[PDB]
Structure formats: C-alpha cells, structure tokens
Amino acid sequence: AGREMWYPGATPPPHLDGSMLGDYGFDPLRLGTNPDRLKWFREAELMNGRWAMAAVVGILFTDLVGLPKWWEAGAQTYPIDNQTLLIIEIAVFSFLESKRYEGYKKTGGTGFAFFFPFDPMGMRSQDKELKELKNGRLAMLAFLGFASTAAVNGQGPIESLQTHLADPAHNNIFTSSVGKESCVFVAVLSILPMLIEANKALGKGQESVPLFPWNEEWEKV
Amino acid sequence: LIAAPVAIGGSTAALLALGRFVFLPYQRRRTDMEVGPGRLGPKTTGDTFFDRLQKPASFVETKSKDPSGFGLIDVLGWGALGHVFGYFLLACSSLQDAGIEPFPR
Amino acid sequence: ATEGYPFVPPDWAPALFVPLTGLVLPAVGMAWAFTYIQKER
Amino acid sequence: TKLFPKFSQGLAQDPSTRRIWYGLATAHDFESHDGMTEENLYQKIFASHFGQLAIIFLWTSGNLFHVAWQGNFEQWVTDPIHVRPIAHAIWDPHFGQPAVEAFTRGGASGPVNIATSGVYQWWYTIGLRSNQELYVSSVFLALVSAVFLFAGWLHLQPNFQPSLSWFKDAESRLNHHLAGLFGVSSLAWTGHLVHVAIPESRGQHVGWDNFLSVLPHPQGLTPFWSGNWAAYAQNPDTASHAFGTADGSGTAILTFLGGFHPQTQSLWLSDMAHHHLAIAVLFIVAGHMYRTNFGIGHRLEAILEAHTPPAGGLGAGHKGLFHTVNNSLHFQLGLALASVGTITSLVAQHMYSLPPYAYLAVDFTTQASLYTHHQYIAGFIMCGAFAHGAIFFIRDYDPEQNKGNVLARVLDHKEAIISHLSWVSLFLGFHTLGLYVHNDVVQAFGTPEKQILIEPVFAQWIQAAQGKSLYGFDLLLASSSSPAYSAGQSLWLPGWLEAINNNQNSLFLTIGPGDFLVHHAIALGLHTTTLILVKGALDARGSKLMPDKKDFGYSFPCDGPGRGGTCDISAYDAFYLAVFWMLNTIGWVTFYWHWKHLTLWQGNVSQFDESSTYLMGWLRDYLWLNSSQLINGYNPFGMNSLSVWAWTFLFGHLVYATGFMFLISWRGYWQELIETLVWAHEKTPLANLVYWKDKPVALSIVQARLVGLAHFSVGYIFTYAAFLIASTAGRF
Amino acid sequence: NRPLWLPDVIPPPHLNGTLPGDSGFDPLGLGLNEERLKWYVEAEKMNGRWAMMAVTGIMGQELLGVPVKWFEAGAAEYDLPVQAQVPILFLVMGFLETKRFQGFRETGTSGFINSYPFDPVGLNSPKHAVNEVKNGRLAMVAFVGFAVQALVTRTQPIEGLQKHLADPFGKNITYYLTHTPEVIAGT
Amino acid sequence: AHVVKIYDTCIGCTQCVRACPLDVLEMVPWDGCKAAQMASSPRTEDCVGCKRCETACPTDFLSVRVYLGNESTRSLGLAY
Ligand code: CLA
Ligand code: CLA
Ligand code: CLA
C-alpha cells in the first residue's frame, strides 16, 4: 500500500496491495475488499474531492470579494425562481451524470459531456492524478472544517483564520463548545494506531481481519 | 488505654518466641503429612510460564540461617500474628477506656 | 456542555437515536444473521 | 453443508430449520463442541467471563448515563419523600397525545418512566449528589467495560493464553480472590464510604477536587496507629438529624448504634462503615490461608483426605474429592450457583427488613420490586445450580476415582433420600392443603371461629429471643436480668430493641396463624422443588427404567414408547419440570411479602391477619382488590399512567398462554401440519418460485419444552411485575 | 558469583546474572517468560528514565523558584490552556511511542527516532547500563517518596529534607503521621 | 445419522428386524446364543431413531440400542 503509510509502522491490508495510486494503508473498516468495489469507491472519492475543491475555492473567492455568508446565502433573493432552478439543474444533471456513468462503464475515466477522457490539452500523467487526489482529500477536510466553523464559530474561513492569528492559544477548536469532545476524539485517534500495533504484535499470524457488516471478510474467519 | 509501642512489641515478641521455641517442632510435621514425599507434594510439573507460577518460590527453601527452621516467611507470619494480637488488646483497652463495657454485667 | 461534558446529549438525541436502534440496527442484524445462517460450505 | 454452526460440523450438515435453533442453543456448550480440548475450553470460558463482565459494566454505565441525562436526581436529592425517581425518557412515536401528557411524571416536561430500581436511594446514600458525578461514573464504567473487553481479547492470543494448570490452581485462586476480590475491595468500599458518604450525609461536599484537603475524622488517623479506636465512635449522629444537612450531627466515622435512622428509616452509615471494615479485615486475614509458593499454607486435598471420620461413619470420607471438584467444571459451577442463589435469597430477606439506603423504606414499590426481582433471580440460580449438578453427575463423574467416599455413598442410598423427600413433600402438601381447604369451607359457612388457627409458637419464641416484647415471653435479651441483654447493652441493644419493637418498619413483623400456614406452604414448595431436583440429579446417570442414561447425554428427548413409556426421563426434563414448581414457590413467597407489606402500608394489618388464613380471602383481597387500579390503565372513559402496566399484564397472560401452546401439544402432530404447509407452498402458483433453503421442520421435543418453559417464565414474570408495580404504585 | 540481592545465598532459577543490574530479586517469579522478560526490562528501563526526569523536574522547579508547587501545577494559569495542551501532548508522544514500538519489535532496544542506538557521544558500556538501571530504580523509589510527601506532609520534598535536617526527632514519620492531624490546615 | 448398536445379550428371536419399517437391521450368524443369530445394522445411516426395535427387544436390558444425534434429511423423515 505504498512505502508511505497512514501511521509509521503500518502493515498493508491483504486486498490493499498498492497497485492503484494514492494508497497509504488507511483501511480500518475495509469497505473496498473487492476490485470493482475499490475502483467505484476511488471514482466516488475523486468526484467528492473534485466537488470539494470547487466548493472550497468558491467559498475562498466569495469571502475574499466580500459576498455574504454561504450558509445564509440560500435565503438571499435571486433572479429566476428556485423551483425552476432546481428543475433545470435536475434536467441538465440527468444528462451530465448519464454521460459520465456511460463513459465510466465503457472506459472508466471521469470525463465530461461527449469527450471521454475530457483532456483537450493533454497533461495526463500518474503524478497529476496523485496530486489531484491529495488536494481533493484536503479539500473535503477543508469543507468539513468550513461547515464546522459555520456551525459553532458562526464566521467565515477568513474570519476564523484571522481569529487564529489574533490569539492562537485561546482561539481554536479545543477552547470552543466542541472542545473537550475534540480532545477526546484526538486522544482516541492517537491511541488508535498503537492498539492496532498491539493487535499485530500479539496476533502474530492467523488473519485478525476486521469482520464487519459492510464487507464479506468474515466468511474466511 | 495501654501504650501502643510496649503492648505491640510485647505481643509480637511473645508470638515470635512461641513460633520459634514452641510451635516450630509442631510445625514441619503437619506439613510433612501435607506436602510430604509419598503424599500430595507438587501439584504441578512445570512446562510453561503460566504453569511455573505455581512452582515454589526461590527464597523459601534455600537453607536455615537460624538454628531452627524459622525462616523469613515464618518470621513475617508470626509477626503478623503478634501485630494482630497487640491490636486486639489495644482495641479492647480503648473500648474499656471510653466508658463502654462490652462484657456481660 | 456545562457539568455534562462526558457524552454530551443534545435535545434531539432521543428523537434521532430511537429510530436507528429500533429500525436500522434490527435491520442490519437481521440481514447479517440471514447471510450468516444461509452461508454455504 | 453449511458453516453457521462452526463449533459443530454435524449440526451444519442438518438441512432442516433445526440447524439454526440447535446452533443458537448449543452456541456456548463448549464441552460438546467438535475438536475442543480442555485447555482451549477453559480459555474460551475465560474470554466469555470477561465478555459477561464487560456487558455488566456497560449495562450499569448505561444506567448511570440514562439517570444523569433524563432523570430527576437533583430534584430527588432536594426532596426524596416527594419527588419520584425517573428511569428513562419515553420516546415512542406510536404514542398518542393523551399518552405523552399522561407520562410526564416526577415534575418533568417530556414523557418519562418512573424508576423502581432503587438506584436513587443507593446513590443518595453513597454521596452522589450532582448529575456530573453520575456522568463521570457512567464514562468510568464504560472505560472499565472496554478494558475488560480488551482483556478478554487479550487472553486469546498466542503467548497470552494461560495453561490448563493455571486454571486448575485451586489454593492460590481461593487465596487471591478471598484476599483481594473481597478483602481490599471491601476495604476500599468502606474507605470511600467514610471519605465521601459520611461527610456528604452531614452537609460536607467531598469530591476529587477537595478530598485530599478535608479529613474524615478530626483525630486524623491517630486512633489507627495507636490503639484508641474508640475515638471513631465518640460523637455519632443524633436522632434529630437530616441526611442532607448537618443539623445536630456528630463527627464519627465508625459506630455501631444499630437499628435504623429515625428520619431516613435506614441503617446508619457508620454502622455499615465499621461493618465493611471488619469484613475487609477478616477477609484479608482469611485470604492468607491456603498454600502457595511459600512454605506456609493449607492444601485442599490434604484437608479433604484428612477429614475422614473413623468407624466407617462416612466410608472413605472426603477422600478423592479434590480432583472431582477440580476436573469437573460443572461441580464448581453448581457449587458457585448454589452459593450465589443462597446469598441472593439472603440479600432479598435482609434488605427489606434492614434497609441499607436512605428513604428506601418510604418507597414501597421500589422495595417490593427489588425483593421480588432478587427472589426470582435467586430461585432461577437455584434451579441452574441443581441442573448443573445433574450435568456433573452425568458428564464427568468417576466412581472408581472416588470409591466409598461421601459422593459414592450418597449415590449408594439415593432411593432413600428421594423417598424421604417425597414423603416430607407429600406430608406437607397434604396437611397444608387440608387446613387451607378446611378454613376455606369453615369461613364459607358463616362461622370463622371454627377454623384451625395454629399459632406460630417457635418463630414468635425466636422473635422474643431477638427482642420482640409483644408476645410477652420471658426470654433472654428481652428480660433485663439475662446475660445476653447485659452483653452489648451499651453497644447496640437500645437501637436494635427500639427498631424491633416499632411495628411501623419492616423489621420482624408480627406473625399470625395465616403467616405460619403460608410459611409451611413455602417450606412445602422448597421441599418439593428440592425433591425433584435432587431426584433428577441422582437419577441423571442411571435408573431402574434406564440404567444407561449417561450414554444418551444430559439433554435428550426420551427413549421411546417401550418399557411402558419413557417420556421426560432425562435430568434436563427434571429441571424443566422443577422450574414450574420454582415459579409457583417464588410466586407464593412474593404473594406473601406483597400482601403483608401492602396491608402494613395501608395500616390494616388485621385484614391480613384474619384474611390470610383462608384461600378465598387471599384471592379476594390480593388478586381482586389490588387489581382495581391495574386494569383501569386505559379504560375507554379515561386513561392514565398505568397503561403500560395493564398492557404488560395482558402481555404476560398472552405469553403464558403461548407457553401453554408449546407445553400441551407435542411434536408429531405439528410435523404433519408443517408437511401440509410444505405441500401448500411448494405446489401453488406465483409462490413456488420462492423456495426455502432450510427445510421447515417442527420444533424438537427438548426444544419444545425449552420454548414452552421460556414463554411460560417470561409471561409469568412480566404479568407479575406488571400487577405488583401497578397495585403498589396506584395507591402509593 | 553476583553481589546478589539480599543476605541469604539464593541461587535464582531464571536470573543467571547477564541482565543489567541483575541481583536475583524475584520472590514471586513474575518474569519466567523470556519474551515477558525482555518486554518488562524495556518497560523497567523506560519507567526508570521517566522517574529520573520527573524527580529532576521536581527538584529543578523547586530550586529555581516557582509560585506554584509540583502537585498543584496542573491547576495553574499558563499561556496555553489545559484544553489546548492535551491534544498535541497525546498526539506527538503517541507518534513517538508508535515509532518506538515498531522499532523495538525487531531491534529489541530503546531509541528516540530512527537512530535507535541514539549515541552521538558513545560510551555505551555495560557499566553505564547497570548505572542507568540502578539510578532509575533509585529515582523510582524517590518519586514514590515524593508522592507520599505530597500526600501526608503536604509540602515540597526539599522542604521536607530541610525539616528533617533542622529537627530530625520531631519531624519524623511519627510526628507527621499521628502528632499532626492539622496538616490539611497549613500544619 | 443415528448410531445403532447391538450387544452380545441378543439371542435371536428375529423380531427386532420385523418391527423396523426402514430396513436398518439385519441378522448375521453367530455362536454366542442358542439360535446362532445376532442382530446387525448395516444401513445405520437410514435409521430415524423410532426405537421400535427397542419396543420389540425382550432382553433386560435391551440388546439393541439406538442413540439420537447428528440428524440428516433421511433420519428426520422428511419427504421434502
Ligand atoms: C468427643 C468425641 C467425638 C465425637 C462426638 C465425634 C463426632 C463426630 N466426628 Mg469425630 N473424631 C474423634 C472423636 C469424636 N468425634 C477422634 C478422636 C478423631 C480422630 C482425630 C475424630 C476424627 C474425625 C474426622 C476426621 C471427622 C470427624 C467427623 C465427625 C462428625 C461426623 C460423624 C459422622 O460419621 O457423620 C455422621 C454419620 C453419618 C452416617 C452421616 C449421616 C447424615 C445423614 C444421612 C444426613 C441427614 C440429613 C437430614 C435430611 C437433615 C434434616 C435437616 C432439616 C433442616 C431438613 C461427628 C459430629 C467428620 C466431620 O467433620 O463431620 C462434621 C470428619 O470428617 N471426626
Ligand atoms: C396448583 C396445582 C398443583 C397441585 C395442587 C399439585 C400437587 C402436587 N404435585 Mg404438582 N405440579 C403442578 C401443579 C400442581 N401440583 C404443575 C403445573 C407442574 C408442572 C408440570 C407440577 C409438577 C410436579 C412434579 C414434577 C412433582 C409434583 C408433585 C406434586 C405433589 C407434591 C406433594 C404435596 O404437595 O402433597 C400433596 C399435595 C396435594 C395438593 C394433595 C392433593 C390430593 C388432595 C388430598 C385431594 C385428593 C382427592 C380427594 C381426597 C377427593 C377424592 C375423590 C377425587 C379423586 C375425585 C402433589 C400431589 C411431586 C410428587 O407427586 O411427588 C410426590 C413431584 O415430583 N408436581
Ligand atoms: C467519501 C469519500 C471517500 C471515499 C469514497 C473514499 C474511498 C477510498 N479511500 Mg479515502 N479518504 C477520505 C474519503 C473517502 N475515501 C477522506 C476524507 C480521507 C482523509 C481523512 C481519506 C483518506 C484516505 C487514505 C489515506 C487512503 C484512502 C483510501 C481509500 C480507498 C480504500 C478505503 C476504503 O475502503 O474506504 C471506502 C470509504 C468510503 C466508501 C466512504 C466512507 C463511508 C462513510 C463516509 C463513513 C461513515 C462516516 C464515518 C464515521 C467517518 C465520518 C468522519 C467524520 C469526521 C465526518 C477507497 C478508494 C486508501 C487507498 O488509496 O487505497 C487504494 C488510502 O490509503 N483514503
């Protein structure tokens, strides 16, 4: 699963050999214990990351130019009625996602419209999609943070960064109303690789696979 | 109320003297008909780590620096008995000194 | 929350938690058990 | 060939629906599992015991969290006599608008459920005041449950699984468990009590932030290193004292006044502090007894083989018995379950008369539910103890290993034991029913003075010996000139005498002839249950109708219609028949307890005294009079908070009747009906495409008895709990 | 052959004497397994190192001069709050311990990060290992003593040393255990 | 399937094979009885455990013994 791991000293899962890119050994639940399932989940991760990148850059631009808050932007008035806006959005997506699904069925790439792959100028190379996957995952983490700072802080990303720069000792996640829960979660996440290490050390062989409802790895147990 | 150090020391010295000079010849005879050669003896054999824990310790069968068989374990046990008896006597003296009479009248 | 910081309960905690553990949890249990008992070999 | 029974390959070869039921029923019968050795069996039992411990700790952690979240523990702390405890909120989306309104009890907003478990009184007694402390308790118990689950996972890996001889270490396990699991555990309990609950009962808040800054006793451990332990009992709490404040209180941490608190109607906190301290000291002393790696100690086999009386009194005595108990896990399980059931019965008989929690005696339904719950738990544990003793007798019992000992001699004259048990059971039942019917008909003819009222003289004589002066017996500890009264006259006599001469509490109630008759009926129930369980245990391996019962396993249906008929011949069947008598006997004891205490709380003890003699009065004034509020839970004119109790009452009736459905009819008529249903499904349009993979077969006879007993007991327990709680809570 | 552990000549069964600081101290026999022996000698060495760091921090803080003692230093006003301290405190040392364990699984020794010998200055003598082990045991006993000072005497360790120096008889175990029940109220 | 065992107490009235409507039991020559016969169970996998041979057995205790357990599609008597 690549020489670089999700924590130092991790062992790759048996299904997660590292043939496909972006692999770091991070599979505790092992949703993708099937090649078709794994490639579908890679496609879904790429799409959620791409939409996350688009949303994050849109929020950054709108907060830089002074447009108002995005979670309150749905209550703002706009030209064209909202019902017919949803209607035309559904109508155009019933063609766009259809072409995407057919192209993924015949090719597997994440193309657009009638061009599969939609690469007109042509810099397709494995490091490019590696960088895209990394930036995409960082973008969904950023969008989750944006939603969190819209919920509890009630301010935009730029205002949250300004408050972090003004007083980083007391303006953070851990001094907020979600502070002690975040401390507990990060404590659990710090302990978590070490319990896995103890399971690997004491369970020297056998399988010790995580048997869960979402995967059929319990059949071999 | 009886002073604690003199009572505790006297009780534990009496119990240690009873254990060494009196109760020791009766000791190592009840155990000889308990863990002797032809009878029970060792409950385990010794192959694994969880099975060697029931084996006897290393410091309880070495030899007898005392002229009798009074070892460190016997010293600790009879000293515990002496501390128990001294604390019992001190507790009875304390209950008497509080004006409360435990005995039937 | 104040004086309730371990396992903070929201006000919508029963109205959300009861239908997963009466609806979704028995369904996952039923499906997992049915795939278990019917597994061949 | 399936693999859902992984422990049993043969069960996986069964193509019928019996595979799922037998796989679920023999899931943890590891001794009969395929390819299982002794050491792996013991390791699996260790892991399962850790899992049960984790489940118990998770359950009590959830109880703490639910009380801290949706309860009214602060309001109960402010006013225990007025505010009712709350167990959990009721979020049922099928509830109606009157249903939500009619369940906001205890001064709450949403629909909540009134707690009868008694944890409010217990937690107020041990010093828990704020719900923050209950939250910390819940998260700590969840953490320790996770720790126990990890430890159960820990002792299943290589280089961590203990050996077979580690489990068979008899002397050191007893030493360590007696010294630590009981001794320093009780010492830590009384230390926590003295540190927290004793100041919290006197208006002094003790917590993790300031327990190192406050002191339990003003003398400050100077009594302990000296001998002056009487300083700890110098200024106890006075009669005019409140449990929430320090009005007329004293600075004493270990006292022995005895009796009950005048306000809380419960035992004194310092009494329990000295009690657990003395128990801790005695258990730590007794835990240094058995032989370990050091040269001192006692060996169990030496004591067993030495205790053989001469002249052939017990034959070989207790020789050869150490290996019998050690090798057979069912012997240890039966002994443990017998002791656990006896202790549970003792607990039930001792919390009600001596309430250990503040304001527990005021909460009548709480005490009744606690008594009935622990009595039924004790009885089920008794039945399990006798069943597992029978399992020992059939599975692992070598007469050649222990020949001529107490076990072989008990098996030698087992017919005499069974016959004498049958004689005493028949005699008790015959005479008790004779006087009950006699007093029934005598009361029916309009002349109740002709009924046979045998006054209980032995138990009232004992009560006079224990200090009850109502009967006027000139006895020891009741007369001032007796040496028993003079001994302890200034220690705990004026508290115990004041508590036992007050009829308002539950300490040693006055007993009449009906009390004596119901006591002998209880003795009859215990005797008959003992008779059947003992006979099934002794006939578990051999009988004159079937000598080779040991070759057919513990739980087998029958031997056939030959030799006159061999239905219910197994010791498992003896257990299954004994559970009904157990249910009837505990029903009798709980009927007696509930009716006597209900008449005590209502103040009309004369009604119970003159009505418990004859069974018609028993029925009319217990099952009919107290059920008026029960069945009015959801009357068409009006509905109130007793709707769950009437619904649960009828639910218990329905499950009892389904138990009757499984109990009367037997498999063999059901197989033909299921065959006709098979022909119906297989041979119909639009449904022959859907076909079963497990063949539908009827429930096996052992399975039939088990499910009939399960529905029987579930319906019994639910309907009795519903009636008891509704009847006690409708009036008070 | 060894200086042994206590007077009586014990021929210890499992402890031959090749361990650093081996004296034969095992009256119950807890480490009969070799894997358990190596895991627990590594744990003993780490606990000794932590004990030395703890006691030296305590004496350095008391000698340098701080307004708040070591047993009350948790509840003190700092530049970073307790809520913002424990996330990175768990995270970075969980990283360190995970790297240490995943290296110790094959090396069998200690080590900060990657360079597991961790000896830029050398002098890795067995005498130094024995000195480290016994100095760690001494610091372990010292930290236990310090904790019991903070429990009973409610004072700093060097202050307790000064009290035993000024009045050796009148400040001993008997005085602070029986003669002074008012240690909570500022002695 | 079920386990059917015949002990040496058999003396050969050749009636336990008539009471079994499943052709489980067969009769082999022997020398330990007057009738020089002994019951045998070649098709022991076809037995359901109906114990009719036990009803037909006149010896005390019975020479033929049928032990339940490990049920299959033929020992359960299902035609489906
Ligand atoms: C003072 C003289 C004296 C006396 C009175 C006794 C008396 C006794 N010794 Mg003995 N003993 C003596 C001298 C004496 N010994 C000497 C010199 C030695 C040599 C050192 C011993 C060594 C010795 C040993 C080693 C043991 C005894 C034991 C016993 C007791 C049991 C006797 C027996 O065989 O069981 C009684 C005889 C029976 C046949 C048992 C019948 C029991 C029936 C069947 C049970 C009935 C149950 C019934 C339903 C209960 C109804 C109750 C209701 C509530 C339901 C008995 C009380 C044994 C013991 O500890 O037992 C307590 C024992 O192990 N003794
Ligand atoms: C409430 C119903 C009920 C009653 C009254 C009984 C009564 C009895 N059962 Mg029980 N039993 C019951 C339900 C009941 N059972 C149920 C539901 C089960 C679960 C299957 C069992 C399971 C069970 C077992 C497993 C055993 C018993 C046994 C007994 C006897 C115990 C001995 C005794 O108490 O003295 C006698 C008790 C009486 C109530 C006396 C009844 C006879 C009176 C005097 C009337 C006699 C007739 C009268 C003179 C009129 C004559 C004419 C008339 C015949 C037409 C007794 C006959 C035990 C036994 O028989 O061993 C000795 C035993 O081993 N029973
Ligand atoms: C929903 C988006 C999504 C999807 C579809 C995937 C899918 C995949 N990732 Mg990826 N990943 C994601 C988000 C996602 N990830 C995020 C946000 C991070 C950063 C934390 C990562 C970090 C990451 C690493 C470092 C690695 C992967 C890898 C993988 C592959 C195998 C792992 C697997 O089976 O999980 C399948 C996962 C899903 C189908 C989605 C998860 C299902 C839900 C969301 C979980 C339920 C909620 C749960 C409690 C989490 C909530 C978090 C909370 C804070 C909101 C698979 C192609 C591995 C790889 O490349 O293998 C080839 C690998 O090494 N991912």
Ligand code: CLA
């Ligand atoms: C802690 C004590 C303890 C222990 C360690 C055991 C352990 C054992 N017993 Mg014992 N037993 C106990 C208590 C105990 N039992 C008690 C209290 C009883 C009396 C009720 C029995 C009665 C008993 C019998 C009669 C037999 C055993 C057997 C066994 C073995 C396998 C049982 C098993 O796990 O199957 C797992 C079983 C199940 C998962 C079935 C659960 C169904 C339950 C019991 C019905 C409950 C009713 C209802 C559905 C509950 C829910 C309420 C509903 C409203 C939701 C095993 C050696 C059997 C044996 O040795 O094999 C030959 C055997 O024949 N025991």
Ligand SMILES: CC1=C(/C=C/C(C)=C/C=C/C(C)=C/C=C/C=C(C)/C=C/C=C(C)/C=C/C2=C(C)CCCC2(C)C)C(C)(C)CCC1
């Ligand atoms: C089947 C079986 C079994 C089981 C059994 C059982 C289950 C039993 C039970 C039993 C029981 C359950 C018993 C009980 C007992 C009891 C007793 C024995 C008691 C006693 C008591 C006493 C002696 C007391 C006294 C006193 C006191 C101290 C105080 C007050 C007064 C008086 C005097 C009362 C086993 C496992 C073995 C195995 C084999 C078979």
Ligand SMILES: CC1=C(/C=C/C(C)=C/C=C/C(C)=C\C=C\C=C(C)/C=C/C=C(C)/C=C/C2=C(C)CCCC2(C)C)C(C)(C)CCC1
């Ligand atoms: C060296 C030597 C010597 C000497 C010795 C001695 C002198 C000793 C002593 C000793 C003593 C003199 C003592 C001991 C002790 C021990 C022990 C081991 C103890 C214990 C104790 C205990 C255990 C206690 C307990 C308790 C408590 C804690 C509290 C409560 C009460 C009681 C009591 C229970 C000589 C010269 C001779 C010879 C040579 C050598």
